[PDB]
Amino acid sequence: GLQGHDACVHHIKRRDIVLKWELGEGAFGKVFLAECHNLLPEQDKMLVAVKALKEESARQDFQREAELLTMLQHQHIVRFFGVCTEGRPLLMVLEYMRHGDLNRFLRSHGPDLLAGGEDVAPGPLGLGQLLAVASQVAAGMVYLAGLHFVHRDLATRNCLVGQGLVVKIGDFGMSRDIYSTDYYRVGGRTMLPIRWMPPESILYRKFTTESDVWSFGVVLWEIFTYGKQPWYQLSNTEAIDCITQGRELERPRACPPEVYAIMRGCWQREPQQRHSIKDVHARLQALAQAPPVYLDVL
């Protein structure tokens, strides 16, 4: 949720889009892999991800998000190419990221050869790689915070990984469907990612950019646990109890004390006492680009 405060959006002819197969499904839409012709000059035919809108008040929500996604274009935000309102169904065309969402990617390269591939070394992701993934997400949040936007659902399941392990921020979408365990259903139709939410959000229903750095601290934890659910040993209410009462997540086995200090800095009780996202990224990128000699002794 980017809230977070015709045709500014670009438009793609329906004939230029050729659906290949389904990549996944949500309650509000399906995502397809597709060929998109004449989209980029250098590539005569390129693969894209196409989200098809399920159904009457969604057109308004559709137009909103498209306008948002077109404005929010940065190196670590998922690339948005445009929409196809040329008849129905309404389509949204996005960059395809072959490794899927970051959470799934983390689990498939967690401990535990066979896992290694074109983009990834075998076995568990190295320290340098985990920092590289974390640094990229932070950069994305630095951009969002710079435009004074707020991401109300920052989690690895809402990040995407592409070729060369390029990591970009999105916001599913599908996350409420069969990632359901990550959300707590309040009221009739509201779901809250409580395990990622700071005390002021759970208690006071406030969410600011300072809340995002708390949420990022949790993302940083997800990364170094290779995509483990935060407070996985706790029920939703028990998680609410622990968060509002000041209890913090344990240091992940793969997480160095140097990096765990960055998490704690993101997890200060008082919002104004947390570090800025610009500074968290700064510290992470320094480690990401740090020579092996430096990182080995971490």
Ligand X SMILES: Cc1c2cc(cc1C(=O)Nc1cc(CN3CCN(C)CC3)cc(C3CC3)c1)OCCCCCCCNC(=O)c1ccc3ncc(n3n1)C#C2
Task: Answer yes or no whether residue 170 interacts with ligand X by CB under 6 A.
Answer: yes
Q: Of 25 and 86, which has the nearer Cβ to ligand X?
A: 25
Task: Answer yes or no whether residue 67 interacts with ligand X by CB under 6 A.
Answer: no
List phi, psi (to 5°) of 260: -65, -25
CA dihedral 202, 197, 211, 132 (to 10 degrees): 170
Catalytic residue at 212? no
In the bound complex, what is the minimum distance in angstroms from residue 197's beta carbon to ligand X?
Answer: 16
Task: Answer yes or no whether residue 51 interacts with ligand X by CB under 6 A.
Answer: yes
Cα 61 from chain centroid (whole Å):
20
Q: Of 163 and 273, which has the nearer Cβ to ligand X?
A: 163
Identify the active-site residue in 153, 171, 182, 212.
153
In the bound complex, what is the minimum distance in angstroms from residue 201's beta carbon to ligand X?
Answer: 16
Among residues 85, 131, 171, 285, the one that binds ligand X under rule CB under 6 A: 171
Task: Answer yes or no whether residue 173 interacts with ligand X by CB under 6 A.
Answer: yes
Length reported for the chain: 298
Inter-residue long-range contacts of 201-205, CB under 8 Å, 24+ positions, other chains counted: 202/240, 202/243, 202/244, 203/244
Q: How far apart are CA 257 and CA 30, in angstroms?
A: 42
On whether 270 is known to bind a ligand per the annotation, the reply is: no
Task: Answer yes or no whether residue 123 interacts with ligand X by CB under 6 A.
Answer: no
On whether 51 is known to bind a ligand per the annotation, the reply is: yes
Among residues 9, 12, 17, 29, the one that binds ligand X under rule CB under 6 A: 29
Q: How far apart are CA 157 and CA 57, in angstroms?
A: 26
Q: How far apart are CA 193 and CA 223, in angstroms?
A: 17
Among residues 12, 17, 62, 65, the one that binds ligand X under rule CB under 6 A: 65
Q: Of 190 and 233, which has the nearer Cβ to ligand X?
A: 190
**Contacting residues for 187 by C-beta, under 8 A, at least 6 apart:** none
Task: Answer yes or no whether residue 24 interacts with ligand X by CB under 6 A.
Answer: yes
Residues 116/122, Cβ–Cβ less than 8 Å? yes
On whether 27 is known to bind a ligand per the annotation, the reply is: yes
Question: What value, to the nearest 5°, has the Cα angle with vertex 222 and ends 142 and 245?
Answer: 90
Task: Answer yes or no whether residue 227 interacts with ligand X by CB under 6 A.
Answer: no
- Count of residues near ligand X by CB under 6 A: 30
Tell me which stretch binds ligand X (CB under 6 A): 95-103, 105-113, 181-189, 267-275: 95-103
In the bound complex, what is the minimum distance in angstroms from residue 248's beta carbon to ligand X?
Answer: 27
**Contacting residues for 33 by C-beta, under 8 A, at least 6 apart:** 19, 20, 21, 22, 23, 47, 48, 49, 50, 96
In the bound complex, what is the minimum distance in angstroms from residue 262's beta carbon to ligand X?
Answer: 23
Residues 154/195, Cβ–Cβ less than 8 Å? no
Q: How far apart are CA 278 and CA 280, in angstroms?
A: 6
On whether 24 is known to bind a ligand per the annotation, the reply is: yes
Residues labelled catalytic: 153
Residues within the interface to ligand X (CB under 6 A): 1-4, 23-26, 29, 31, 49, 51, 65, 68-69, 72, 77-78, 94, 96-97, 100-101, 160, 169-174
